[PDB]
Every structure is written in C-alpha cells, then in structure tokens.
Design a protein around this ligand. Structure first.
Ligand SMILES: Nc1ncnc2c1ncn2[C@@H]1O[C@H](COP(=O)(O)OP(=O)(O)NP(=O)(O)O)[C@@H](O)[C@H]1O
Ligand SMILES: [Mg+2]
Ligand SMILES: [Zn+2]
Lengths: 223, 569
DNA sequence: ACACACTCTCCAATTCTCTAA
DNA sequence: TTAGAGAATTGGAGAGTGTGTTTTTTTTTTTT
C-alpha cells in the first residue's frame, strides 16, 4: 500500500500550486482563493474537481476512483492543515455552538468537533453515467455516477456527529465521535479524580455543545 | 492423494496444442475477452479419457475442483499477469449426459452429489444482491492490516464481494402424470450467471444437487447449485424471395394451419398479425402504433378455437387466456411478498409477459366489464399504469391481441343487424383493426369436401408407430415458415408517393361510399383509424415481399382485405 | 450481540485478645 | 489509664455461568 503521508503532501502541492488559467486567464489559483474564503468562514462546502487533478497526475485520479473513502478523509485533513496559512482576519462570533467552543478555548488556554467545512468530489468527465441495473457488486467502494428519476424525499432531520457530556462532580467535559448508524451513550465519569476517589458522578448530555448536521433520505428509479 | 494426479490429468487434457489445439484456442479467446469461465464439452473429455470422464459425473465436487485448478495453472503458464487479475477461475459443462438427464419430478435423493441436467420452465426470480468472500481492515496510524475469508477500520476497496440470486424451475405441464399438479425445484445463480433467465423462459440447467443444513430435525432442503444455464426457443431464403414468379404472400397464407379447411381471408389477416406493421415517431413527441389486433365472432363448430391454439404454437412469445378463468389483477400485475428477503414487490401478469409478442383471448364475451377496463389502456397505448406496493410506475406491455367470441343467443340471427347480434360496446369494438364474422352455412356441396377432409385426417398414423398402438398419457414446411417469418421481421419498408396517393384517393372514395351507405349494411364507421389500418396492412405485405418500398400491389391487397371485412353481408 | 438470574470465590474490614507506652 | 500488634471471623466486591430473543380470491345473505 501507498504511504498516505506522501499522498498528503502531493494533495497539499495540488491545492497550493494549481491554477486553471482561471479568472479569465489571470491565473488566480482557484483552490487558493477558495481556501481564503473557507478560512474566513464565508463558505462551507468545497467541491474538488477530478478533471483538475488529471492535468497533473492521472494515476492519482485512478487512485481516488477506487476506495474513494480513504481519499475523502485524506483531502479533508490536508485542507484542515493548510487553512491557517490562508487566514489573515479575525471572524465575528455568530453561533451558540461556537460560543461553547469559544468558552472551551478560553478555559483550555478532538479536531472533528472544530472541523466546520465539507469536502466533496466532482466526477471525472471520462465516467459515463450507469443505469441503476449496471451498478453490480464489483463496484462496492468505488466512485460511481448514476442517472434516474426521483420518487420520494423525507424532511430534513438533525443527525448526530459528536456528543458532548458534562460531569456533575468534577466539572469536566467528555467527547464521543459517532460514525456507525447507531451508538451507545456514556453513563459514569471516566476522569482520574472521580475514578480514583470512586465518587460516582454521572454524565449529562448537552445539546448546546454537541455537533449536528442536516440529513435527508431519498429514492431514485429507472427510466 | 490421487487428486494431484487427477489435476495432472486435467492439465494435460487442457494442453491440447500437440493435437489440433482446440482448447488452447478457446482459452486464448477467453483471455482476449477478459473473461473468467470456460465451457468444456463432455464428449471430448470422454473420448480422450474414459475413466476420468465417467468418474467426473458421479463425483461432481471432488473432480470439478481439480479441473478448476488445472485451468488456473494453464492460464498462468500462458500469462501470469492475466492470471493475477482474478481470484479463481470457473468451468462449465455441455454435451450429452446420458442417464443424468432428469426433470423436477424424476430427481430424487439418490442423485445427491451427481452432475445433473434438469430442464423445465422458469416461474420466479429474487433480486440480485452482493455476498462477501474476503474482508479487509486497515489502520492508518500504524500501517497495519488484517483479513478474513468465508484497532482497525474496514477497507471496502481491499475487501471483495460477488453477486447472488435465486430462481425456481417447474415441470413441463404437458408431461405431468394423470391427475397430479406439476413439481418444482429451487436453483441458485452466482457471480457471472445472475439474471440470465426470466419468468416464462424454457431453460436447461447443469449443476450439482445438494442438501442445505437445518438441535436438528434430521431433515434438509435440497437445491441445485447451477454450473451453467442454457435457453431454447441464409441462401435458401435469398433464392426463394428472389424467384418473383408468384405472389409469395398468397402461397404462405394458403399454407397456414394445414389441418383447418377454408377461411382464406382469416388466414391472410392472421399472417399480417404475425408479421406486424412498423412504428413511427413525430417531432412533437407523438407516435403511431405498429402492432395489429383482430377479433373473430361466429356460430358453434366453425374452428374458431383451433385457429387460436395454432397461432399459440407457431409464434414466438405467445400467451393463452380465457374470459371466464382470469382476473384484471392476473392480466396486469400483482403484489408479492418475497420469502428470501422479506420484501414486497410486483410480479408480472399475462399482458406484461406478452411484451413484444402475441396474447390469445378465447371466450372473450364471458369477461366481466371491469376486466375490459384493464384491457382498454393496454390495447390503446401499449403501457399499463400501476400504483401499488410503494411503486408508481408505467410498465411496458406492447402486444398484439387475437380474440374470439360467440354471438348473443348462441346462434347468429339473420333477421337482426350485425350490431344487434354482437354483444360488445361500440367503444370497445372501435379498437380492433379487423372484425370477422363466421357462419355454418349448411350447403351439401361444401359439406362434401369438409367431411372428406376431416375423415382423411382421422385415419392417419405416424410413421414411427405400429399397426395397433395407442399413445401413453405422459405446401411449405413449418421449419421454413418460421425461418422466413423470422427474417422478414427486420426489413422495415417505407412508403412510396404512388402508394400514398392511391391510399388517399381510395380512402376518399370509400368515405363517399360509406356516407351513402347505412348502418343496416356495415359493421362500424370508417375514420382515420381506417387509414392507419391500411398503412399497417400495406406495410406488412411489403414486408412479406422483403421489398424495401411499399408498392401499389401492397396497397391494393390491403384495401381489398378491409373492403371484404367491412362491406359484405 | 446484548440484558436478567443465579452461583460462587477471594480479599480485607471488624472485633477479640495480648501487649507496651 | 490509654493505645498498638497479632489472630479469628465475617461482608461484600467482583467474576463466571446459563439462558432468552395494506392486497388477493371465494363464500353467503340481503339489498337493489
Ligand atoms: N373447416 C374445418 N376444418 C377442420 N376441422 C373443422 C372444421 N370445421 C370444424 N372443424 C371441427 O370443429 C371442432 C370444434 O372446433 P372449435 O374451434 O371449438 O369450433 P368453434 O367455432 O370454436 N365452436 P365453439 O368453441 O363451440 O364456439 C374441431 O374438433 C374441428 O375438428
Ligand atoms: Mg371452439
Ligand atoms: Zn467527573
């Protein structure tokens, strides 16, 4: 397998150096500009285009198309590492969830809780759309493109991403990142003071601190 | 440990380049097409090595694994890089199996672990879904990984899966023993064999018969793990069509259904139904119906039912139905609970299964009108709209309907008009292309030849049968007819200015004559649908000639046919 | 895979007894 | 007189084991 550290540096190089002959050929480095907007919280999602990557490294594009999930995580971490370099400005406080984070910083002075951006791939122009019948089991885990008609859509629901608890006795806080479709919550304090004294303090979950994302379910059908 | 020598036998059988090199050529083709299964003919194996061939059929499992390994080594010896692209290779079998050819009734518990060759008719399918064979997990913090076959996080791109499906085969009903219902068996399809058969198909499956486990009651369920799946259904046609000495369409029509005497025009119309017209589409999104529908009405004992039972045997993808024995749900589609997955889904009815085919409705006048409401949408637009089991869908049901009925009061009445004798609604009667009336006119001159022909038919005995035998319970040749019709279904001929002009002028003349005529002398009114019918019939006649143009001869034949159908007492 | 009910074990807390501060 | 060390009895903290878990065809009475 590849060294994902080397791949991380290659991705950083792409973000740092790529220009699409952009802004009417003025070569203003589209992804650098995007990183400025992301750093100043002007924008949330970032759609990286695989046709741009193909100009420098088609083998990287092929590496992405199979086992896409690894490269999703990789690109997200690369963007988080590069974001402070494109910052120059202090942003105004505008969200209760971030007021909690600000209090947490003030008291301190995991990264998943702070990572307020989304990263998605726009498919390479080589890949023609499949019909819903041709997405067979040899395509598990691979990036695909599909075409059809929508039949049903749900309302938008809050989906849990990381839970935040508080302890009645010791005044500390704890975190629990969520990935599977289900989880089991915490009960009793794992901090060293409570544990060593066996003082039995309980954990209360805080909807003012935990992180949520907009989630919706949909169905699509053959022509 | 003789299997290492058995594998050695199979490897030197596969290395046939020293003796005419057929199997090496086939393996080379397999490589070029990027495939991973081979089909071996058991006759060749039996010829080269009697011992190994006769042992394979009685020890399916232990012998086939050796054959697979021999194939893997041989392809690796040709190209190691190609051999590394796939985990394992497969082999399928064909030829003559002798005593192992069975049916779902004759297959019994003594056949377990034999290679068997079952045949029957497919009745249902489950949905394709994946199965896991090898799973992988990885840790980026340590560059560590683990695997399993059938902390760290799962690697979907390093793991691998394969497809799985279930189908069911049923005994041929013509072969059932007296007074019993047909038997059936469950077949498993896997990897590259999924979705190779659908309901109503006649198939022949090769596989290994095996039990499935199930405290235990000491009782098992048996299934057939398929190993291969098979389906069943130029110069002569060129020189025959090139002759041009006679009107070929008349000869083919005369030769239709030799047992049945008389009824020339009905035979010609049925041949047009078998050949069909052609579709056309318009820039506004509209389209013209290419298929033809026919209706027959008449007295008892005038061979109406026999013509339906004949078309059903001499046309591809044809379905029977009777008016009293069927329901609207059965005609269109019904909701079904799957026992493999637990899910609810639709199942095709009679008119859906007849897509791009023919459907024969006998005893049409005994249907409840609620079923005719279902038939209306199908006959007009070729689609059927369904709103059940969480699905809102527009299914495809493009088919030609051939239907037969008997008049009101049982025997047709000469002193009443056609619209009085015929029991159906005028709206429904406007959908069929042609409507024929048939009557038992008791002339002795005609009875002479009819009775003679029937009696000749009852004295025949087949040449393979002896003087006193009785059977157990359980002119153009037919073969050429099938082949000629099958090739003629490709031609797609086109209008000519002269034929279009003739049809337009003649339609205006016919409309004037109809305007002069009265309902006491006609079956139904003449409108634009008459033009569509004329165009379809002329197209079909041109199609029979294989002439790329629709000619004046085709148009003249078409108008004569509809003239006879509409303007005779 | 994840919860009740039951059985069982070993570690060390509580008191008796003898002794020194 | 007040307090600590060595020996005996007993509670309970903890581990291990066993088990459970809408959608189609056909009849009958009474409404038409
Ligand atoms: N011209 C004929 N040639 C051959 N057999 C004929 C002919 N006319 C009648 N028959 C016989 O008629 C019998 C009944 O045929 P059938 O198709 O049921 O007639 P039908 O018009 O459908 N009458 P019915 O089903 O009662 O409405 C068959 O056994 C045939 O042998
Ligand atoms: Mg009949
Ligand atoms: Zn605590």
């Amino acid at each position: 397998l590849k060294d994902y550290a080397l791949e991380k540096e290659k991705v950083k190089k792409f973000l740092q150096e790529f220009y699409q002959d952009d802004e009417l050929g003025k070569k203003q480095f589209k992804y650098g500009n995007q990183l400025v907007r992301l750093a100043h919280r002007e924008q949330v999602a970032l759609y990286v285009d695989l046709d741009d990557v193909a100009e420098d490294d088609p083998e990287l594009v092929d590496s992405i198309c199979e086992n896409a999930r690894r490269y999703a995580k990789l690109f997200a971490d690369a963007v988080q590492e590069l974001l402070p370099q494109y910052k120059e400005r202090e942003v105004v406080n505008k969200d209760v969830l971030d007021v909690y984070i600000e209090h947490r910083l003030m008291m301190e002075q995991p990264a998943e809780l702070m990572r307020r951006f989304e990263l998605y791939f726009q498919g390479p122009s080589s890949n023609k759309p499949r019909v819903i019948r041709e997405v067979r089991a040899d395509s598990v885990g691979k990036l695909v493109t599909v075409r059809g008609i929508v039949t049903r859509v749900s309302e938008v629901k809050p989906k849990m991403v990381v839970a935040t608890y508080t302890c009645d006795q010791c005044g500390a806080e704890t975190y629990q990142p969520i990935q599977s479709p289900t989880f089991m919550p915490l009960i009793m304090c794992p901090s060293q003071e409570c544990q060593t004294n066996r003082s039995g303090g309980r954990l209360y979950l805080q909807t003012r601190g935990s992180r949520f994302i907009k989630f919706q379910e949909m169905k699509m059908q053959e022509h | 440990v003789e299997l290492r020598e058995a594998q050695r036998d199979y490897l030197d059988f596969l290395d046939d380049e020293e003796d005419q090199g057929i199997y090496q050529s086939k393996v080379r083709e397999l490589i070029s097409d990027n495939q991973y299964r081979l089909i071996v003919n058991v006759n060749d194996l039996r010829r080269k090595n009697e011992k190994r061939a006769n042992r394979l059929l009685n020890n399916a499992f232990e012998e086939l694994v050796a054959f697979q390994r021999a194939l893997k080594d041989f392809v690796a010896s040709i190209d190691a890089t190609y051999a590394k692209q796939y985990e394992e290779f497969y082999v399928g079998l064909e030829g003559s199996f002798g005593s192992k050819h069975v049916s779902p009734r004759t297959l019994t518990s003594c056949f377990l672990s034999c290679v068997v060759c079952v045949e029957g008719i497919v009745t249902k399918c489950s949905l394709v879904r994946p199965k896991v064979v090898r799973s992988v997990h990885y840790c980026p913090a340590t560059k560590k990984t683990i695997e399993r076959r059938y902390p760290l996080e799962t690697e979907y791109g390093l793991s691998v899966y394969k497809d799985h499906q279930t189908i069911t085969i049923q005994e041929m009903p013509e072969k059932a023993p007296a007074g019993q219902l047909p038997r059936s068996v469950d077949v498993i399809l896997d990897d590259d064999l999924v979705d190779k058969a659908k309901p109503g198909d006649r198939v022949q499956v090769v596989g290994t018969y095996r039990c499935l486990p199930g405290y235990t009651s000491g009782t098992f369920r048996t299934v057939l793990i398929a190993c291969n799946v098979k389906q069943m259904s130029i110069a002569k046609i060129k020189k025959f069509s090139k002759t041009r000495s006679k009107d070929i369409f008349d000869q083919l029509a005369k030769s239709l259904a030799p047992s049945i005497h008389g009824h020339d025009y009905v035979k010609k119309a049925i041949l047009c139904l078998l050949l069909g017209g052609v579709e056309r589409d318009l820039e506004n999104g509209s389209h013209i119906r290419g298929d033809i529908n026919i209706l027959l009405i008449g007295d008892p004992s005038v061979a109406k039912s026999q013509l339906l039972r004949y078309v059903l045997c001499t046309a591809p993808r044809a379905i029977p139905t009777t008016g009293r024995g069927s329901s609207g749900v059965g005609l269109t589609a019904a909701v079904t609970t799957d026992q493999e997955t637990g899910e609810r889904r639709l199942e095709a009815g009679a008119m859906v299964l007849a897509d791009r085919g023919v459907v024969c409705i006998d005893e049409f006048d005994k249907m409840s009108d609620m079923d005719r409401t279902a038939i209306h949408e199908v006959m007009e637009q070729g689609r059927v709209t369904i709103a059940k089991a969480g699905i809102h869908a527009r299914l495809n049901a493009r088919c030609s309907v051939l239907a037969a009925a008997n008049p009101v009061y049982g025997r047709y009445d000469q002193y009443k008009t056609p619209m009085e004798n015929i029991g159906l609604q005028d709206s429904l009667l406007s959908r069929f292309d042609l409507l024929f009336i048939m009557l038992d006119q008791m002339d002795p001159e005609q009875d002479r030849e009819i009775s003679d022909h029937v009696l000749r038919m009852h004295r025949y005995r087949a040449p393979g049968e002896q003087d006193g035998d009785a059977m157990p319970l359980g002119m153009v040749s037919a073969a050429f007819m099938k082949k000629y019709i099958h090739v003629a279904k490709i031609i797609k001929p086109v209008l000519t200015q002269e034929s279009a002009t003739y049809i337009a002028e003649e339609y205006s003349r016919l409309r004037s004559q109809d305007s002069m005529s009265s309902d006491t002398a006609r079956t139904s009114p003449v409108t634009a649908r008459t033009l569509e019918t004329l165009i379809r019939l002329a197209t079909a006649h041109a199609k029979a000639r294989m002439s790329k143009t629709v000619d004046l001869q085709d148009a003249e034949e078409a108008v004569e046919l509809v003239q006879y159908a509409y303007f005779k007492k």
